[PDB]
């Protein structure tokens, strides 16, 4: 149903500067300044900028131990879900600890998706929607939506939001109806992550329908 797109030759070990380049390309991608898929996980960087770094040891240590696929996951998981890495330096974000905790989450994505769907459904009853669709539609009054609010409160994950988006078109519709800064900040990350996620919309839809049905009856 869902797979993360990854740089080619993921079993490879690379050097410290290369680890730094990988981090920078993913960082820029998550900020909407680059597209790792468009450029096939390759990017040129400023050596002067790298040399100016006071934390070159961080990238060196990671390079000694982790394969390319693991390095990519460490950076992706942190830059997507670790708010401490959204603006703060990766060498200051407790990245490895965060990554270890996040890989376990990625391994159970389908179960987590189902869990999130059930929670979205029961929440919809608590707020007394007149129709389930009201949860996902942008609300001009509050410049937001219940589904976005749930993501903000960390009740559901980014993967769940993007999975729902695959067949509900939530992100693009929100983007066209508002300029809200808070949404935009999240939307930049959502669209960036969506680019590296390979999602089978039909399968995600099937899971959604089956899960809601089990909540209703
Ligand atoms: Cl599958
Ligand atoms: Cl599947
Ligand atoms: Cl599957
Ligand atoms: Cl499957
Ligand atoms: Cl399947
Ligand atoms: Cl399957
Ligand atoms: Cl109606
Ligand atoms: Cl309607
Ligand atoms: Cl309506
Ligand atoms: Ir499957
Ligand atoms: Ir209507």
Swiss-Prot record:
Keywords: DNA replication, DNA-binding, Viral DNA replication. It comes from the Viruses. GO terms for molecular function: DNA binding. InterPro entries: Phage_T4_Gp59 (IPR008944), Phage_T4_Gp59_C (IPR015086), Phage_T4_Gp59_C_sf (IPR037082), Phage_T4_Gp59_dom_sf (IPR023197), Phage_T4_Gp59_N (IPR015085). It holds the Pfam family T4_Gp59_C. Changing residue 139 to A: Impaired interaction with SSB. Changing residue 38 to A: Impaired DNA-binding. SUPFAM superfamilies: gene 59 helicase assembly protein. Gene3D superfamilies: 1.10.8.60, Bacteriophage T4, Gp59, helicase assembly protein, C-terminal domain. Changing residue 138 to A: Impaired interaction with SSB. GO terms for biological process: bidirectional double-stranded viral DNA replication; DNA replication. Changing residue 27 to E: Impaired DNA-binding. Changing residue 122 to A: Impaired interaction with the DnaB-like replicative helicase. DNA helicase loader protein that participates in viral DNA replication, recombination, and repair. At the fork, required for loading of the replicative helicase onto DNA protected by the ssDNA-binding protein. Coordinates simultaneous synthesis of leading- and lagging-strands. Monomer. Homohexamer; when associated with DNA. Interacts (via C-terminus) with the DnaB-like replicative helicase (via C-terminus); this interaction brings about the rapid assembly of the helicase onto ssDNA. Interacts (via C-terminus) with the single-stranded DNA-binding protein; a ternary complex between the helicase assembly protein, the single-stranded DNA-binding protein and ssDNA is an obligatory intermediate in the helicase loading mechanism. Interacts with the viral DNA polymerase. Binds to single and double-stranded DNA. Belongs to the Tequatrovirus DNA helicase assembly protein family. This is DNA helicase assembly protein. It comes from Enterobacteria phage T4. The gene is 59.
């Amino acid at each position: 149903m869902i797979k993360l797109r990854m740089p080619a030759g993921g079993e490879r070990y690379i050097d410290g500067k290369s680890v730094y380049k990988l981090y920078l390309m993913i960082k820029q991608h998550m900020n909407g300044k680059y597209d790792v898929i468009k450029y096939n996980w390759c990017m040129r960087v400023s050596d002067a900028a790298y040399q100016k770094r006071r934390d070159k040891y961080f990238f060196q240590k990671l390079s000694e131990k982790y394969k390319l696929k693991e390095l990519a996951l460490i950076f992706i998981s942190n830059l997507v879900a670790n708010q401490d890495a959204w603006i703060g330096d990766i060498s200051d974000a407790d990245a490895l600890v965060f990554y270890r905790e996040y890989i376990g989450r990625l391994k159970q994505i389908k179960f987590k998706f189902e869990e999130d769907i059930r929670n979205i459904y029961y929440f919809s009853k608590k707020v007394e929607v007149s129709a389930f669709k009201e949860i996902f539609e942008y609300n001009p009054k509050v410049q937001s939506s219940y589904i976005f609010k749930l993501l903000q409160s960390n009740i559901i994950s980014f993967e769940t939001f993007i999975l729902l988006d695959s067949f509900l078109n939530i992100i693009d519709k929100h983007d066209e109806q508002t300029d809200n800064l808070v949404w935009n900040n999240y939307s930049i990350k959502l669209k960036a992550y969506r680019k590296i996620l390979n999602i089978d919309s039909q399968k995600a839809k099937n899971v959604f329908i089956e899960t809601v049905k089990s909540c209703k009856y």
